[PDB]
């Protein structure tokens, strides 16, 4: 069983190298991980948190669960990352979501794609939970419409391809629920709304939450594998960081 | 693809799938000649079945489960040097 995983990783690293060369030659479709299951099998998602999570972090995970139609929340009590990921792959899950916080303030968001990656880590800013909204009510859990704005670079498409597959395919045409991710200077503002088609336009209503996510690590492997080779990383001490844009 | 299939297929590719060739890649044996001796003596099992013929080619799905036989004196050596001989498993 370990031998099979070792072999598959080598094939995978070879595949991305071949895919990378093909793209570079084209420089002179859906990614290989998701091409097999794109639009065929709906995603299977687990959302969890760090050990001894604060009450707010548990609340935030529930909100992320409600965001994703096929998400299931799992308590991380004493689970070990190999033990977590192995237990996850057996059940057949597609993605794993793990959250961190600071004094009940969500801080980071990491997404790892099974069986073999990639793994993307995000940092959260201006997080506004729905529980902060009084008398808000319950969400709608229909398959929502997706909006991807200002993703231009090759990495931007990669971030799109990762994020896009977390949802179920083929939302019904008049679905009132829409999720939007707007890139603004590598800072993706995540918003979701419920709209009503009026006779003279569209009216939208926020249900919450609000948060800004920035990719800072994208790695060709599962989150457990701290040995895996890095596809891309965010350089902060470079002299051009204060004005460099990537997405 | 088919045009690849015309030229990709080679004798070396078929020889690569030879069980004597394979475990050498798996590092069970130093050398192909050491390998053919072991298989003839009957220490190497593919899945639940024992193979004594060197010319067997292992298909990919069976590639993972090629291994020694439980009561092999070789395996008894394997766990002995690393000091994990467990006599309940008789290996």
């Amino acid at each position: 069983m370990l031998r099979r995983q070792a072999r598959e990783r080598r094939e995978y690293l070879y595949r991305k190298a071949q895919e990378l060369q093909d793209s570079q030659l084209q420089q002179k479709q859906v990614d290989d991980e998701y091409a097999a299951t794109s639009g065929i099998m709906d995603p299977r998602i687990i959302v969890t948190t760090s050990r001894d999570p604060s009450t707010r972090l548990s609340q935030f995970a529930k909100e992320i669960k409600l965001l994703f139609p096929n998400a299931v929340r799992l308590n991380r009590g004493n689970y070990v990352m190999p033990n977590l990921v192995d237990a996850c792959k057996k059940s057949g899950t597609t993605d794993l979501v793990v959250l961190h916080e600071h004094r009940g303030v969500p801080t980071s968001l990491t997404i790892s794609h099974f069986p073999h990656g990639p793994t993307a880590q995000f940092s959260l800013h201006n997080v506004v939970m729905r529980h902060d909204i009084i008398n808000a009510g319950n969400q709608s859990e229909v398959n929502p419409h997706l909006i991807f704005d200002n993703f231009t670079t090759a990495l931007g498409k990669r971030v799109v391809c990762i994020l896009k597959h977390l949802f179920n395919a083929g939302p019904k045409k008049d679905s009132e629920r829409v999720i939007t991710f707007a890139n603004r200077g590598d800072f993706i503002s995540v918003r979701q709304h419920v709209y009503v088609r009026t006779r003279e336009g569209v009216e939208i209503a926020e249900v919450g939450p609000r948060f800004e996510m920035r990719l800072f690590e994208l790695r060709l492997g599962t989150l457990e594998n701290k040995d895996a080779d890095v596809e891309w990383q965010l350089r902060r001490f470079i002299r051009t960081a204060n004005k460099k844009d990537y997405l | 693809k088919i045009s690849d299939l015309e030229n990709k297929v080679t004798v070396s590719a078929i020889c690569r799938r030879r069980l004597p060739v394979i475990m050498h890649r798996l590092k069970m044996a130093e050398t192909i000649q050491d390998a053919v001796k072991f298989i003839e003596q009957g220490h190497v099992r593919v899945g639940p079945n024992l193979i004594n013929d060197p010319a067997y080619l292992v298909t990919r799905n069976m590639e993972d489960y090629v291994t020694w036989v439980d009561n092999s004196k070789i395996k008894k050596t394997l766990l002995r040097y690393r000091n994990q001989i467990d006599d309940f498993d008789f290996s």
Binding site: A6, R9, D227 | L26, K27, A29, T67, W68
Partner: peptide
């Protein structure tokens, strides 16, 4: 070295090991 440790074949056998 870490990668070698991960993808180690448990079935690998050697002769000088007999010593």
């Amino acid at each position: 070295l870490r990668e070698k440790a991960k993808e180690r074949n448990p079935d690998e056998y050697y002769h000088a090991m007999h010593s």
